[PDB]
Design a binder for this molecule. Structure first.
Ligand code: ZN
Lengths: 55, 13, 319, 197, 111, 20, 24, 222, 26, 290
């Protein structure tokens, strides 16, 4: 369930290798966004061809 | 029989 | 689907069941006061159901899913009547106090659903009918025990047809004509013993029975009886034909009973018997309790050697 | 009393609000110790351990010393009555006292009650201390735990835990903490043992 | 009114009893005398009332000399308690103590 | 071969694993 | 007291009669 | 789009890594970085643990997102708006379901969001007020708590409660500055006496413990 | 002393706005 | 056994304490009942049938029992208690149960609101079997309020409740009939007119009988008009049953009142109706005879 996703994400970030160290000037960036309308600009011709690769 | 003597030892019946 | 699923995030078949709220009901009951503190806010005692372990509230009566009629005011009406000793208490803020139509019920406002239930319960002059049945039964008890009671005559004053629901005054209903003389004590309540019937004497006895309809705020009927007695006997409009008597206080909503007055020999046990059995037997009170039940739609599911159960850790006494 | 305490707990949202609700109530100061004891009992009965009750009893100890000595006696009581539980109750009380320790609420002297000889150690107490010290190490971290396990100022109490005089319980206790995975302290003490003869 | 007295005195007794000697169900010889204490025990509505269908010769306790004499030459209405299981509950059960007791009760009862 | 209750017994043990 | 009901046992409004169906 | 996005850097000046996931608002702070002062306190805090060294290396602080509070509030608003043709028990079942669906989803972000607690107080008291309005009065003494919270078996309505908790308050200025603490206790909904009404939050079990529980239970069953 | 604690108006809030001081503050 | 015994013999020699323990074991058996059987019913009926007027002082006991049962959760016991009332109904009065038979009267007027057909039918049965003993003039609770309550039930479109309702209204219209107003009887006529389509024939015969009883109470000049208009319907089995009803109205209120209207209706040019007229005269000459 989604709360377990939040837990696994927090827990995966933390288990990266040498993640919290800042000596050499490393920088972590967390970006989060949205594809802003994917349901609305699908193209049914291109979608046909992309489905044919699968089914 | 044992039932009746048990009851009269015990009480009314 | 045109509705919003608040558990969009889970599935009970696949995810198990991720919460259990069964201690919440238990601890809610222990915090409100227990089933006793909870049911002193209700019409529970006015049902006379012996105890609340049998209570059962009605486990579609018919396919007018469409018809305009709409909400059927019945579940709300039953919640409103059930709780009526609390929704209709006495110590309130603003509210213009008004006596119900033909009864002795006071409302402090306008709760129309509650007023409709209470009206439909006391229809057909049932308040006065209750007064008549109670007083008739008492007269009959005296009619029988004339012998032991030294009673030459018993006088049922043909009733002023509105004495039942006039709450600020009193005629008297029972007048007892002695044979010779009764020596009579000072007034005390029906539940106390020490009575020295010495102070005055008379052949005339009056007895009053007054009906109320209590509520959560005030359902102590002892002090009701004391205060009403003192007032009604020391007033200047109550037509009491004797300075000797007693008043009988009945609480219909909690089916309680008591009395207060000047006693004479034999009276204490006599009316104690009469009260404890008229409260149980009288048919008027029965029609009451039955309309109450049919307005709540409450039912009882209850129907109806021992010494293997007897020597238990449960104490059980042999008398 | 227990009704009112259980209800004040089950009506609040966090240990601060529950402690407030209790202290805004009043009682005769006699059962102050039994106060903490009760919250102790309550978290014993709980779903699983939440440091809520830990935190609440710890705030009471923070509020008066009466509950600190109550807690001394309470840890004595639970070490006396440790087998009296199941492993569930055992683990929750273990994390209880582990909280108490790393909260500084219970004082590290308490270890005097723990003589790590095989003959005197309940397997139930064995599991108790294992959960206790798993929590200590994985909470305060192993550096400051081994550091605090090291300094002499509490070694008088620690003696029952770190066996050097008698060798057989040294074998047993070093084997036990090794099984728990405290390699540092264990093999330092075993090197002391190797130097001993 | 004697029934009523019985009623009020058991009422006062349950009043006087501490939290662990209060009875749970009460059975009397007199199923005609349930009504009085039915009414009188509302101060303690915890008791399942019954009249025992198993008649016990506690009337045969008016046979003994100690109980007898005490009741007979008492002058003040009062309370006393006796524990009939003199030494029994140590080497036999309450089951067996009650069995022993019943046989003795009916023994003094009949003859 | 008759193991749809072992095709439904690592679904749970696959859903209930937590490694990082 | 829906007086059509009370006197003649019958209210034209049925379920929606904002008064009390009662022949008492 | 940059306006609907959010980027967050962690460097030698920002020790906190904040993000916003499925409904939560999380903020990770490691122990290495500027936590000279560290606590272990109310459950709003997950303790992340480095799985190889098995030491607690950071803390994640959770809150409910703002649009999730707004979604709960609009949900209550349509419970109330479409309820004039329903009975008291239907209104209270809809309230019960909405509130369970929020509390069992978030579960410890609710403790830490001082704006939720006020939302829940006002929303529960609006439901109660509509039931009073259903009768023809809103007098606070005609409707003690017992009328609403009594289970459906004793004839009550059966409400589930989260509005009788005290709301912690502390000194707005620094509270908008530096996470100062809790000094005062504003009051939640009004009960007829002390009365100590129980709480939904105490019967639902936090996540951070369910995840450890699950780990061990399935490990030992395997 | 409205010391930056409480509500501006306890008016449409579902509460009486009564404030108190955290007794378990030490 | 006991039932067979006292039913063949009579209860002359049954003395006091004997009859007591008997009545009490009876009450027990009937409460304790756990099967749907006429066993305990018939036992009760016979036992009081033989006690005759000897039973007296236990009517509080007997009823109080029955009423507490009438309160139960499961239908079956409720129905049983309604039955038992319908048995002891006569002795209930004959011991002069003012409070108590008054009780049963008004309390059943209460339960008239049930919606378990199996209990509603038995309630109607018990009310009928009270009204049989007590003729309504001396009734504490009067059919003057019962029957007005019953008329909105005749629209319940279910065979069992319809059977028992039309039975009760037929009793009342036969014997009571004067504690009700002409207008009430007219509305009830208009409701009977569509019981004639029930799927069960007992209902339809009961309906025709009550048209007869209402025929004496109210002149049929209007009921006959409402019957001809039904003859105009199609589908035969309600045409044929209205033609029976016409015959019945004519038999009770003498045939000269209806013969001119029938004959004149023989002139409307439609088939189903000319045949309705002819079939109705058929039944009429059968019913009147000589
Ligand atoms: Zn109407």
């Amino acid at each position: 369930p989604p709360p377990l996703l939040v837990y696994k994400w927090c827990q995966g970030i933390n288990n990266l290798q040498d993640v919290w160290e800042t000596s050499e000037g490393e920088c972590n960036v967390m970006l989060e966004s949205r594809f802003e309308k994917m349901y609305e600009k699908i193209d049914l011709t291109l979608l046909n061809r992309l489905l044919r690769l699968i089914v | 029989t044992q039932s009746e003597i048990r009851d009269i030892i015990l009480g009314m019946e | 689907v045109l509705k919003q699923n608040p558990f969009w995030w889970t599935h009970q078949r696949h995810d198990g069941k991720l919460w259990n709220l069964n201690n919440y009901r238990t601890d809610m009951i222990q915090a409100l006061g227990g089933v006793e503190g909870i049911l002193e806010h209700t019409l529970f005692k006015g049902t006379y159901f012996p105890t609340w372990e049998g209570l059962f509230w009605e486990k579609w009566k018919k396919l007018t899913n469409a018809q305009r009629s709409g909400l059927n005011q019945i579940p709300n009406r039953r919640f409103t009547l059930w709780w009526s000793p609390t929704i209709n208490r006495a110590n309130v803020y603003v509210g213009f106090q008004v006596q119900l139509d033909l009864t002795g019920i006071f409302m402090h406002g306008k709760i129309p659903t509650l007023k409709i239930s209470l009206i439909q319960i006391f229809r057909a002059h049932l308040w006065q009918k209750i007064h008549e049945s109670i007083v008739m039964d008492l007269c009959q008890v005296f009619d029988q025990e004339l012998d032991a009671l030294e009673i030459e005559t018993v006088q049922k004053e043909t009733i002023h047809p509105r004495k039942s629901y006039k709450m600020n005054s009193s005629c008297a209903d029972i007048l007892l004509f002695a044979s010779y003389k009764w020596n009579v004590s000072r007034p005390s309540l029906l539940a106390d013993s020490k009575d020295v019937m010495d102070s005055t004497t008379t052949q005339k006895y009056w007895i009053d029975i007054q009906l109320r309809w209590g509520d959560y705020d005030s359902h102590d009927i002892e002090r009701y009886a004391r205060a009403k007695f003192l007032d009604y006997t020391t007033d200047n409009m109550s037509i009491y034909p004797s300075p000797t008597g007693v008043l009988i206080a009945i609480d219909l909503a909690y089916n309680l009973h008591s009395a207060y007055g000047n006693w004479f020999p034999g009276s204490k046990p006599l009316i104690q018997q009469a009260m404890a059995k008229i409260m149980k037997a009288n048919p008027a009170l029965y029609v009451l309790r039955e309309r109450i039940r049919k307005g709540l739609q409450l039912y009882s599911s209850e129907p109806t050697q021992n010494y293997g159960e007897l020597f238990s850790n449960q104490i059980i006494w042999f008398v | 009393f227990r009704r009112t305490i259980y209800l004040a707990i089950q009506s609040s949202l966090d240990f601060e609000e529950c402690a407030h609700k209790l202290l805004k109530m009043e009682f005769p100061e006699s059962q102050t110790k039994e106060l903490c004891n009760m919250i102790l009992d309550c978290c014993a009965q709980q779903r699983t351990y939440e440091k809520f009750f830990g935190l609440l009893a710890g705030r009471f100890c923070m509020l008066k010393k009466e509950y600190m000595e109550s807690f001394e006696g309470i840890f004595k009581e639970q070490y006396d009555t440790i087998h009296r539980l199941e492993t569930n109750k055992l683990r929750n009380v273990a994390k209880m006292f582990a909280h108490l320790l790393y909260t500084d609420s219970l004082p590290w002297s308490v270890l005097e009650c723990i003589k790590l000889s095989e003959e005197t150690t309940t397997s139930s107490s064995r599991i108790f201390v294992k959960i206790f010290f798993q929590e200590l190490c994985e909470y305060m971290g192993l550096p400051k735990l081994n550091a605090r396990l090291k300094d002499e100022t509490l070694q008088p109490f620690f003696e029952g835990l770190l066996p050097r005089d008698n060798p057989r319980n040294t074998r047993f206790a070093i084997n036990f903490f090794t099984s728990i995975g405290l390699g540092g302290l264990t093999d330092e003490l075993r090197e002391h043992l190797k130097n001993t003869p | 009114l004697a029934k009523w007295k019985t009623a009020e005195e058991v009422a006062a007794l349950i009043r006087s009893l501490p939290v662990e000697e209060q009875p749970k169900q009460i059975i009397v010889t007199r199923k005609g005398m349930l009504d009085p204490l039915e009414v009188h025990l509302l101060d303690f509505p915890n008791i399942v009332i019954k009249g025992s269908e198993l008649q016990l010769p506690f009337q045969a306790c008016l046979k003994v000399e100690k109980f007898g004499d005490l009741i007979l030459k008492a002058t003040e209405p009062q309370m006393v308690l006796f524990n009939l299981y003199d030494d029994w509950l140590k080497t036999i059960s309450s089951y067996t103590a009650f069995s022993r007791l019943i046989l003795i009760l009916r023994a003094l009862h009949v003859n | 071969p008759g193991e749809e209750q072992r095709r439904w017994e690592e679904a749970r043990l696959g859903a209930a694993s937590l490694k990082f | 007291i829906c007086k059509d009901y009370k006197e003649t046992g019958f209210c034209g409004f049925g379920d929606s009669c904002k008064f009390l169906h009662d022949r008492s | 789009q940059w306006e609907n996005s959010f980027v967050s850097v962690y460097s030698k000046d920002n020790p906190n890594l904040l993000f916003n996931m499925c409904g939560f608002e999380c903020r990770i702070l490691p122990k290495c970085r500027t936590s000279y002062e560290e606590f272990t306190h109310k459950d709003g805090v997950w303790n992340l643990q480095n799985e190889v060294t098995k030491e607690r290396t950071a803390q994640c602080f959770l809150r409910v997102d703002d649009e999730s509070m707004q979604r709960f509030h609009n949900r209550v608003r349509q419970i109330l708006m479409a309820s004039g043709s329903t009975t008291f028990t239907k209104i209270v079942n809809k309230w019960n379901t909405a509130l369970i669906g929020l509390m069992t989803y978030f579960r410890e972000a609710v403790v830490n969001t001082q704006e939720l607690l006020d939302l829940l107080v006002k929303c529960e008291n609006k439901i109660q007020t509509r039931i009073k309005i259903g009768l023809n009065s809103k007098m606070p003494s005609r409707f003690p708590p017992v009328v609403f919270y009594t289970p459906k078996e004793l004839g009550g309505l059966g409400m589930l409660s989260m509005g009788h908790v005290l709301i912690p308050q502390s000194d707005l200025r620094w509270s908008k500055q530096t996470d100062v603490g809790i000094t005062h206790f504003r009051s939640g909904m009004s009960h007829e006496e002390d009365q100590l009404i129980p709480n939904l939050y105490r019967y639902i079990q936090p996540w951070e413990s369910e995840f450890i529980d699950s780990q061990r239970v399935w490990a030992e069953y395997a | 002393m409205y010391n930056g604690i409480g509500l501006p108006t306890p008016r449409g809030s579902g509460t009486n706005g009564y404030v108190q001081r955290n007794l378990s503050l030490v | 056994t006991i039932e067979k015994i006292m039913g063949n013999l009579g209860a002359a020699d049954i003395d006091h304490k004997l009859e007591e323990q008997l009545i009490d074991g009876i009450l027990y058996a009937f409460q304790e009942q756990t099967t749907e059987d006429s066993v305990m019913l018939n036992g009760f009926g016979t036992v009081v049938n033989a006690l005759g007027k000897r039973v007296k002082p236990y009517l509080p006991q007997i009823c109080g029992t029955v009423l507490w049962r009438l309160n139960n959760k499961s239908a079956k016991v409720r129905q049983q208690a309604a039955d038992l009332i319908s048995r002891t109904a006569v002795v209930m009065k004959t011991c002069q149960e003012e409070k108590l038979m008054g009780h049963l009267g008004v309390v059943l007027y209460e339960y008239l609101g049930e919606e378990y057909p199996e209990v509603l039918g038995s309630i109607l049965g018990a009310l009928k079997a009270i009204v049989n003993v007590i003729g309504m003039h001396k009734m504490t609770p009067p059919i003057k309020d019962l029957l007005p309550r019953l008329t909105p039930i005749l629209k319940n479109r279910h065979e069992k409740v319809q059977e028992n309702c039309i039975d009760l209204v037929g009793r009342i219209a036969d014997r009571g009939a004067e504690y009700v107003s002409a207008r009430e009887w007219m509305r009830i006529c208009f409701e009977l007119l569509e019981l004639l389509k029930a799927h069960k024939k007992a209902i339809r015969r009961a309906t025709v009988n009550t048209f007869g009883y209402i025929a004496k109470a109210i002149g049929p000049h209007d009921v006959l008009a409402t019957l001809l208009n039904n003859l105009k319907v199609q589908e035969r089995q309600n045409r044929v049953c209205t033609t029976v009803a016409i015959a019945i109205v004519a038999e009770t209120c003498s045939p000269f009142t209806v013969l001119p209207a029938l004959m004149n209706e023989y002139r409307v040019p439609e088939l189903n109706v000319q045949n309705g007229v002819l079939k109705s005269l058929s039944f009429l000459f059968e019913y009147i005879g000589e």
